[PDB]
């Protein structure tokens, strides 16, 4: 149904507010906020959101506390001031997906339309993208397990339309723009290996752990496609790609001729002014 | 300015806004897995950029 | 007609083998060679200004 979503940083800075207005009480649980957006178009666009007092139990996980009057009053006043945005779903700040999320999401599945779920981290130490759109749809399983709520990952992007780019750029004054060239390219080409190294290294350890020490079926069926796609590149002998290395290396030669020739053109004004300026300033100095 | 003046304005930013918003904006200019759109340009150098290299020349 | 370059091909007498091939990237070596030839006059004129100002 929905291919991609658009999440503005305003809601995540509202999660920064979720971490600001705590008051140093010692709970810092998965505070659930009421996510708002535009479900009209096929693409999802989050503009702003708000929160609702949400408290769980220490031992029992099935305890969840929501509010209908606060949702209808905040949504009623927010719709009165801005009727272009309506309820879409919710989101929790907890890093782990608990079992009670089917009951928490089920309320906004009954009263509200199909709600999207977003799992983020309480500490911004994760290098990866903090936002993951998880659609709440029921899928048929091939093994015969009963139909249950399934959270499929929907791709997400963090973009701002008109003003939030200007506000973020003014508040930071440290981040740089695209700036194609040497630095913005070589930084990605340096740290990209760590950007994949922390992800893959962080995933395959618990993966290999759950291979031998795993039960409660984790959908082993998708592991066959996992190792299949991993074995779709069986160390090609590079025999056919030699001519492609001749093509890319020939373009490299083109960059060599462009650099040497163009820089040789740049040497004109320098290697002329260095003489005509020094000898004339010297002969005319005294 | 008569009977109508103004006041100075300063800002404030803690480490949670600095790292969450900074990494959020860098990620807003980066990719999902950060390895997706690299080979796109690495292999577009042979298909599309060649036109930009000929026009550049 | 191959000497007239109306299509891609080449004949043979000993074996009679027909080969058809083409070279699409023609606009690379032309612009590159023109940049080399045009830059030769740049470096030579630079050596004329410096050779004039020195000796």
From Swiss-Prot, chain A:
The modification N6-acetyllysine is found at residues 200, 210. GO terms for biological process: proteasome-mediated ubiquitin-dependent protein catabolic process. Residues 5-140 form the MPN domain. Gene3D superfamilies: Cytidine Deaminase, domain 2. GO terms for molecular function: protein homodimerization activity. GO terms for cellular component: cytosol; extracellular exosome; extracellular region; ficolin-1-rich granule lumen; membrane; nucleoplasm; nucleus; proteasome complex. There is a cross-link at residue 176 (Glycyl lysine isopeptide (Lys-Gly) (interchain with G-Cter in ubiquitin)). It comes from the Eukaryota. Keywords: Acetylation, Isopeptide bond, Proteasome, Ubl conjugation. SMART domains: JAB_MPN. Component of the 26S proteasome, a multiprotein complex involved in the ATP-dependent degradation of ubiquitinated proteins. This complex plays a key role in the maintenance of protein homeostasis by removing misfolded or damaged proteins, which could impair cellular functions, and by removing proteins whose functions are no longer required. Therefore, the proteasome participates in numerous cellular processes, including cell cycle progression, apoptosis, or DNA damage repair. Does not bind a metal ion. Belongs to the peptidase M67A family. Component of the 19S proteasome regulatory particle complex. The 26S proteasome consists of a 20S core particle (CP) and two 19S regulatory subunits (RP). The regulatory particle is made of a lid composed of 9 subunits including PSMD7, a base containing 6 ATPases and few additional components. Within the complex, PSMD7 interacts with subunit PSMD4 through their respective MPN domain. Interacts with TRIM5. This is 26S proteasome non-ATPase regulatory subunit 7.
Curated annotation (Swiss-Prot), chain B:
The modification Phosphoserine is found at residue 28. Widely expressed. Highest levels in heart and skeletal muscle. It comes from the Eukaryota. Component of the 26S proteasome, a multiprotein complex involved in the ATP-dependent degradation of ubiquitinated proteins. This complex plays a key role in the maintenance of protein homeostasis by removing misfolded or damaged proteins, which could impair cellular functions, and by removing proteins whose functions are no longer required. Therefore, the proteasome participates in numerous cellular processes, including cell cycle progression, apoptosis, or DNA damage repair. Belongs to the peptidase M67A family. PSMD14 subfamily. Component of the 19S proteasome regulatory particle complex. The 26S proteasome consists of a 20S core particle (CP) and two 19S regulatory subunits (RP). The regulatory particle is made of a lid composed of 9 subunits including PSMD4, a base containing 6 ATPases and few additional components. Within the complex, PSMD4 interacts with subunit PSMD7 through their respective MPN domain. Interacts with TXNL1. This is 26S proteasome non-ATPase regulatory subunit 14. It comes from Homo sapiens. The chain holds residues 197 to 253 of 310 of the full protein.
From Swiss-Prot, chain C:
It is found in: Nucleus; Cytoplasm, Cytosol. Phosphorylated by AMPK. It comes from the Eukaryota. Disulfide bonds: none annotated. Induction: By FOXO4; expression in embryonic stem cells (ESCs) is mediated by FOXO4. Highly expressed in embryonic stem cells (ESCs). Expression decreases as ESCs differentiate. Component of the 19S proteasome regulatory particle complex. The 26S proteasome consists of a 20S core particle (CP) and two 19S regulatory subunits (RP). The regulatory particle is made of a lid composed of 9 subunits including PSMD11, a base containing 6 ATPases and few additional components. Belongs to the proteasome subunit S9 family. Component of the 26S proteasome, a multiprotein complex involved in the ATP-dependent degradation of ubiquitinated proteins. This complex plays a key role in the maintenance of protein homeostasis by removing misfolded or damaged proteins, which could impair cellular functions, and by removing proteins whose functions are no longer required. Therefore, the proteasome participates in numerous cellular processes, including cell cycle progression, apoptosis, or DNA damage repair. In the complex, PSMD11 is required for proteasome assembly. This is 26S proteasome non-ATPase regulatory subunit 11. It comes from Homo sapiens. The lineage of its organism: Eukaryota, Metazoa, Chordata, Craniata, Vertebrata. The chain holds residues 368 to 422 of 422 of the full protein.
